[PDB]
Structure formats: structure tokens, C-alpha cells
Amino acid sequence: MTNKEFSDGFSTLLNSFGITPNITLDEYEKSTFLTNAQEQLIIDIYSGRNIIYGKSFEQTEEIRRYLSNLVETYETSTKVTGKLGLSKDSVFFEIPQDTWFITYEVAFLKDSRLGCLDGIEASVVPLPQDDLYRAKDNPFRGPSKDRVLRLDIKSDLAELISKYNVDKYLMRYISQPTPIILVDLPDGLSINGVSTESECELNPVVHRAILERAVQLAIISKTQLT
Amino acid sequence: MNVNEFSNEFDVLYNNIMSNAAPGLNEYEKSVLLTKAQEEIVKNYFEPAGNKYGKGLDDSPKRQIDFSELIKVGEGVLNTSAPTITFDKRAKVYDLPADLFLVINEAVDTNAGTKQIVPISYSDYTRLMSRPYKEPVKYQAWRIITTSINNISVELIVNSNETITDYKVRYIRRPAPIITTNLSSEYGDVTINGVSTVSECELNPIIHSEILQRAVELAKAAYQGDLQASVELGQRSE
């Protein structure tokens, strides 16, 4: 569905300007509620907390077809120099700053010590800080040629603890979806920092579910004190 | 029924049957009372509370057919002829037709399609400009009356990045006076609303009897002349 179709369906479902009591929204309010419904729905889908679906990020074909258009791949070889880490062999990499959740995360290694295995792809294991001390020396869950520990730190950074030098850092995350903005908003206004029209980038399959959730949010907004 | 029939039946209903007959009315007086009755009937019938039935402009077939001959459609002229101070920075000033009595429907044709104009009140203006958006809904536009001289000037507020192509106004034309005879005189030309020539009732014949009855009632109230009659029959001026 397009922005015009989004607005028209929103009005039709809300029974705007009908004879019965009803609710009429501005295009800014329609955009706000559509964006809120979109982001709520995709977060609930990713966490598997939607009772209707009850499935996780890629647990079935339906959810794949829903959130296929947020999956973005990223590559980086630059390392942030001045930072204080929890180990000597700690390197820091920037995050794209539009990430929502990291779903695939792997690290290529370039070191002489692992001879004839150079350029080995290594599995970045997100490790909590409780386990870090007892995982540094762990030969089965600690850093090694086939495994790297990533700890999240401030300023959108990723502290990669490896026994070998880390050359490249690969990611595949869920991106910020573009907001659903149905009209070029006036000066000052914006949704997610976007002022112009913005079409939903997901598939049309989930557009109608987003519309239903946005409508429900609208009625909740108008009918939370009565 | 033409002006001659108004005057003749006015005499018949006023003083040709009454027992202790009163002095007959001059044609200027009859024309005055007929015009006043015309405006009074129009104002009574436009507002539901103004008449005994509780029915307004379009609340029954009779009320439709009453104003059928008084409805007119025109266009507002863009008021870029001279500079002016608009209350709202993003409002385009338009001038309504001179012969305007009441506005019942307005519409504006923009590049984004036709949009119905909603006349927003001053309290609704204050409420709506307190919200973050400050623009109309999708298929409507907003309107407020601005500095008007000799004719109504109107401020149209549309959504951003929209240009107005035309501004049609379905209004009720100002009724023309009912004048029985050429009021030209050597002693001085008298006029009802600026016209001394004969002027027929330009409304449907369905309400000609109604206007005549109201004229007779006003004539007899003036004849009585006490404060009571004037006060109770002024309640229907509205």
C-alpha cells in the first residue's frame, strides 16, 4: 500500500466523517501512529513476543517475508584507537549507528601465528561481563582462532577480544526502518528526523497489520481517559 | 404573485374587511413592511430555532424549495490588489461577492485536489494552532474572516506546499426589495435598499403568502404602537 492508500484505509477503518460517532486524524497523527505501530510490530516480531505470530526473527517464512527489508550487511576494517578496555588484546570497532539488533556478526583474522590458516573467518560470540573473567582463560568458550568475544561499550562501539589480530569485522543487523510519513510535514516537525514523505520499506504483507495496529493505537489515544 | 397582487391582497387583509377600518397604508409603507417581512421570513427559516417547526435550511422539502430561488454560486477574488496584514502568515486573502447574505457551502480547488472549507471558530483557531501540526485534515481547508471593508474578506489556510486555483462559494443571495410602485417623486426620491423602481419578489411563490402575512402582522403591530407589540413582534426579527 502507498501513502495515499495508507491514509484512505486509515480513514475508512476509523469511519471518519460517517454518521456514527468516530475519530478524525490529521496526516501528522496518522504518520505518528503508523510509525509507532510499525516499530512496535517489528520489535515484538523480532523478540517473538507477538501472541498472534509467536515467532522470532527468522523462525518461519512469514517472519522472513515481513522483516526481510531491514536486514543490512556491514563491513569495516578501521579500529578506534583511544579507548580503555578489559584486556590488552582488545580492539574497538564503530557500529553503523542505524543498527537495531545485531543478528549475524563475524570477524576475519590476519595474524602470522595461525600459520596456513591466515584469513580465517571467526565467530563473534556476544559474551556477558559475568563470564568474561572465567572465559578469558577458557579454551572452549574463550578467544581463539575460531571464536571472538564481543562486548558492547558506550558511544556505539563493539569491543572485540581476540587472541589473534582482528583485521576485518562483518555484520548483518536489523536497520532503523524508514518512518511512514504521509505528507511533507511543515518546518520544525519530523518523524525520526525525516520531514518529507517516507514510504514503508517492508513488504505489503505486513502493511495491513501495521494499519490495524495503528488504528488500535489511535482509538487507545483518544479513549484512554473516558 | 406580482407587486400589484401584493398590494391588493395587503389592503384586503389589512383594512378592507376590518369593522372599524383603519387608514389605508401608503405604497411606501407597504413596500417597507413587505421588505422587512421578507428579511424576517428568510432569517426565521434559515435557523431551526427561529420558526415553530424547528426546521432549518435543508430540514424538509419545503425548506429546500423556499431558498431554492435564493441560492447562488460564485467565486472569491484573490485579494492581492493591495497589501494587508493577515492574522496568519500562511493565509491567502480572498474577497467574497458583494451580494452575500449567508454562506452555506465553500470549497477550494488546489493542486492537491478539491478541499472543503471548514469555518473554524476563534476558540477552535486557538485550540488548533496549539497542536504540533497546525494544518487541516486531508480533504478540508480552514477559514477565518479577516479585515473586511465594503465586502467580506476571507483568510484561507491550506496545507503546506499547496496553491489555490479557485475558491467557489455557495451562498444565499441577498433578497431584493419588494416595491409596489415607482417611488420617484418630485418632493424627493425615497428608496428601500437604494432602488426606487418597481421590484418584484425574487423568491419562490411558495412563501409569497407567508411574506404577506408577516407584513400584515407588522402593519397591525405598528398600528397598535405600544411597547408590548413592538417588543413581542421584534423577537422574530432575529
UniProtKB/Swiss-Prot annotation, chain A:
Gene Ontology cellular-component annotations: virion component
Subcellular location, record wording: Virion
Protein origin, superkingdom: Viruses
Keywords per UniProt: Virion
Function text: Forms the tail multi-ring barrel with ring protein 1, ring protein 2 and ring protein 4.
Subunit structure: Homododecamer.
Miscellaneous field: The barrel is composed of five stacked dodecameric ring structures. Podoviridae-like phages usually possess only one such ring. The tail is thus rather long.
Protein's recorded name: Ring protein 3
Organism listed in the record: Bacteroides phage crAss001 (Bacteroides phage PhiCrAss001)
Source taxonomy: Viruses, Duplodnaviria, Heunggongvirae, Uroviricota, Caudoviricetes
Curated annotation (Swiss-Prot), chain B:
Function of the molecule: Forms the tail multi-ring barrel with ring protein 1, ring protein 2 and ring protein 3.
Keyword match Coiled coil: no
Top-level taxon of the source organism: Viruses
Keyword field: Virion
Note: The barrel is composed of five stacked dodecameric ring structures. Rings 4 and 5 are both composed of gp34. Podoviridae-like phages usually possess only one such ring. The tail is thus rather long.
Protein's name in the database: Ring protein 4/5
GO CC list: virion component
Assembly mode: Homododecamer.
Intracellular or extracellular location(s): Virion
Secretion signal span: none
UniProt keyword Disulfide bond, yes or no: no
